[PDB]
Amino acid sequence: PPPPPAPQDVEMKEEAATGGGSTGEADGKTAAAAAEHSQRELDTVTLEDIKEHVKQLEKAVSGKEPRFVLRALRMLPSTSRRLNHYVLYKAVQGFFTSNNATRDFLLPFLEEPMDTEADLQFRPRTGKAASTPLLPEVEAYLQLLVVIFMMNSKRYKEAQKISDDLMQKISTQNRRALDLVAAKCYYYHARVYEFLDKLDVVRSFLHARLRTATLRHDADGQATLLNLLLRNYLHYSLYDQAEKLVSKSVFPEQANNNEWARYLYYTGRIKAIQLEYSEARRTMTNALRKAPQHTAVGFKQTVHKLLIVVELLLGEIPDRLQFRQPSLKRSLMPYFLLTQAVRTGNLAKFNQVLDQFGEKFQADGTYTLIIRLRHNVIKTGVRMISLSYSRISLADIAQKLQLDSPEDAEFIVAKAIRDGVIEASINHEKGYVQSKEMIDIYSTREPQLAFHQRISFCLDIHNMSVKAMRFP
C-alpha cells in the first residue's frame, strides 16, 4: 500500500498526456504530426515494459483498471473535476480494502467510457480505452485464466480495427496515433496468437489490415504490418516471398528508425535463405551498424549469432569475439567452435562440430549453412592459396587439401574460374596449373569511376541534411 502510489502516479501521468493532451493534440493539430503526446505515450509504454505495467500484483489485486476507466465525459470545463474524482479515488488502495475487478469484470469496464455519455469524437481516446487497460494484461502469459483474456482483449482490439476502419468516415489522420499504438499491440497480437498455435485467418486479418492502410492513411501502418507479415512467413513454411518479389512496396519515410533497421535485418534473413551472399551481407551490415543503441541487455546477441551466419558462409571471417556477451558464451559454446571450424580446414572437425552441436544447429534451424559450408572451406582454401602463389600446381594444393586425384582438382579450379576469383589456367598435359596473380591490374581511372558514387553519395547526404535542416 505505499508502493501502489507509484502506479497511481504514473497512471495519471500517462492518461493525462494521452487523454486530455493528445485529445487536444487531435482536436485541431497534426500538421505533419503535432501529436507529440503520442510519442510520449509510446515512451511510457516502454516505461511500463521496463517496470511492471500497473497492477500485475503490486502487493494487492486489481485496483486501477476498475477505477480510472469510468467517467471521462469530455464536456463543460469542469471535467477536471472528473480528473479530481480520478485522483481522490486513491484512498481505496491505501485506506480501504482492495478487491479483484480485473480480467473478468473488464468486459463492461471497456463499455463504460461509451455508456457514460457521448464522450468525444476521436478514436485515439477509444484506442486509449482499449489499449492502456489491456496492454497491462498481455505480458503475464502463464496460460491459466490469463491468455484467453489476452485473446478476448485483443478481440476488443479487433473491434479497435473495426473502429479504426469505420471512424471519422474519411481523412482525420488519427492513424498517426492509432497505428503507432497498433504497431506494438499487433506485435502482441501475433505474440499471444502464436503462443499457442500458428495463426490462420489472422493472416487475412493482417492482409486486409495492410490493404486498408494503403493510400488514404499511409503512415507507420504499412511497414509495421509488413514486419508482422514477414515474421509470419518467416516462422512458418516459405511460399510467399515471391509476394515481396512481385509487390515490393516497402519504402516509407522509414519513421521509427529501428523498425527499418530490424526490417532490413528480417529481409536480410530472407535473402540469406532465398540465396545471396553480397546483397544479404550488405543489408545485414547496414542493420548491424544500424543497431540503435545498446540500452537493451543482450538482445543484439542471439539475433547477431543468426545475423553473421552469411559472413561465416563467406569464409573470409575471423573470430567474431568483439560482439560476445559473456552471458552469450554458454550458448555460443557451439558457435565459438563453429567459427573456429571456419578458421580451420579440417574435414573430420568440420563434421565433428556438426556431430557435437547439431541440436544447437537445429536451434539455428538454417542448414543452408552446412549445405554450402564444405564448399566454403574449399573456397577459403582456393582464395588463400590462389592469392598466395602465381604459378601453383593443382597437385600441390590438391594433395595439400587431400583431393587424391588431378581431375577433381581440375573441376575445383574450373568451378573457381566459373566462380571467378583468379585467372588460374591449366598447362594441359596432365593438369599442372600454369597461372598468375594480378597486380598491375589498374589503379587510377578505376578509383575515379567509383568516386562519382562516393561524392554523389556525399551530395545526396548534403541535400538530405538540407531537407533535415528544414525541420526546426
Partner 1 sequence: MYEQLKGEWNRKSPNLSKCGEELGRLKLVLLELNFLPTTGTKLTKQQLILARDILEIGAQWSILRKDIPSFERYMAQLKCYYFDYKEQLPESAYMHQLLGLNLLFLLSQNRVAEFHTELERLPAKDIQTNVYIKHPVSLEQYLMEGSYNKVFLAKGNIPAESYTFFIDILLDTIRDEIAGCIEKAYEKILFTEATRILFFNTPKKMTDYAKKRGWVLGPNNYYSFASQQQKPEDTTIPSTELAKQVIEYARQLEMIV
Partner 2 sequence: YLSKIEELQLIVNDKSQNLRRLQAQRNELNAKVRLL
Partner 3 sequence: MSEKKQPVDEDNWDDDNVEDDFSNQLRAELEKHGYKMETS
Cβ-based nearer residue to partner 3, 125 or 184: 184
Contact between 28 and partner 2 (CB under 8 A)?
no
Taking CB within 5 to 8 Å according to partner kind, which of partner 2, partner 3, partner 1, none is near residue 344? partner 3
Inter-CA distances, 177 with 26, 33, 184, 361, 362, Å: 9, 9, 12, 42, 40
What kind and span of H or E run contains 425?
strand 425-426
Query: Contact with partner 3 (CB under 8 A): which of 85, 191, 290, 372?
Result: 191
89 in helix, strand or coil? coil
The β-bridge partners of 433 are: 426
Cβ-based nearer residue to partner 3, 93 or 224: 224
Check: CB of residue 66 under 8 Å from CB of residue 109.
yes
Contact between 237 and partner 1 (CB under 8 A)?
yes
* Angle CA 256–261–263, to nearest 5: 95
Taking CB within 5 to 8 Å according to partner kind, which of partner 2, partner 3, partner 1, none is near residue 439? none
**Least distance in Å: CB of 61 to partner 2?**
46
Contact track, partner 1, 100-139, x by CB under 8 A:
----------------------------------------
Handedness of CA 366, 368, 369, 374 (dihedral sign): positive
Q: Point out which span in 50-58, 167-175, 251-259, 356-364 binds partner 2 (CB under 8 A).
A: 167-175
Taking CB within 5 to 8 Å according to partner kind, which of partner 1, partner 2, partner 3, none is near residue 79? none
Check: CB of residue 274 under 8 Å from CB of residue 234.
no
Neighbours of 462 (CB within 10 A): 11
CA nearest 93: which of 132, 56, 67? 67
User: According to CB under 8 A, which residues from 263 to 322 bind partner 3?
Assistant: 292-293, 295-296, 299, 302-303, 318-319, 321-322
Contact between 439 and partner 2 (CB under 8 A)?
no
User: According to CB under 8 A, which residues from 193 to 222 bind partner 1?
Assistant: 200
Query: Contact with partner 1 (CB under 8 A): which of 273, 303, 363, 385?
Result: 273
**Least distance in Å: CB of 176 to partner 3?**
17
User: According to CB under 8 A, which residues from 194 to 253 bind partner 2?
Assistant: 216
Size of the site for partner 3 (CB under 8 A): 27
Contact between 472 and partner 2 (CB under 8 A)?
yes
**Least distance in Å: CB of 205 to partner 1?**
15
Contact between 166 and partner 3 (CB under 8 A)?
no
Query: Contact with partner 2 (CB under 8 A): which of 32, 76, 201, 245?
Result: 32
Cβ-based nearer residue to partner 2, 442 or 471: 471
Check: CB of residue 272 under 8 Å from CB of residue 309.
yes
What kind and span of H or E run contains 268?
helix 259-274
Contact between 369 and partner 1 (CB under 8 A)?
no
**Contacts (Cβ under 8 Å, ≥6 apart) of 314:** 277, 281, 376
**Contacts (Cβ under 8 Å, ≥6 apart) of 108:** none
d(CA 64, CA 4): 10
> Alpha-carbon Rg of the chain, whole angstroms?
29
**Contacts (Cβ under 8 Å, ≥6 apart) of 149:** 103, 104, 106, 137
Taking CB within 5 to 8 Å according to partner kind, which of partner 3, partner 2, partner 1, none is near residue 343? partner 3
Query: Contact with partner 2 (CB under 8 A): which of 108, 115, 145, 171?
Result: 171
Query: Contact with partner 2 (CB under 8 A): which of 173, 331, 356, 366?
Result: 173
d(CA 448, CA 444): 7
Contact between 463 and partner 1 (CB under 8 A)?
yes
**Least distance in Å: CB of 166 to partner 1?**
28
Check: CB of residue 60 under 8 Å from CB of residue 100.
no
User: According to CB under 8 A, which residues from 336 to 365 bind partner 1?
Assistant: 365
The β-bridge partners of 426 are: 433
C-alpha cell read off for 342:
571456419
Size of the site for partner 1 (CB under 8 A): 39
Query: Contact with partner 1 (CB under 8 A): which of 207, 434, 436, 447?
Result: 434
d(CA 134, CA 185): 9
Q: Point out which span in 170-178, 190-198, 333-341, 443-451 binds partner 2 (CB under 8 A).
A: 170-178
Tell me the one-letter amino acid at 303: V
Cβ-based nearer residue to partner 2, 330 or 470: 470
C-alpha cell read off for 102:
480485473
C-alpha cell read off for 324:
560476445
Inter-CA distances, 374 with 43, 127, 153, 219, 258, Å: 47, 54, 50, 46, 35
Taking CB within 5 to 8 Å according to partner kind, which of partner 2, partner 1, partner 3, none is near residue 299? partner 3
Q: Point out which span in 41-49, 160-168, 341-349, 463-471 binds partner 2 (CB under 8 A).
A: 463-471
Contact between 423 and partner 1 (CB under 8 A)?
yes
Query: Where along the sequence are the contacts to partner 2 (CB under 8 A)?
Result: 31-32, 169-171, 173, 216, 467, 469-472
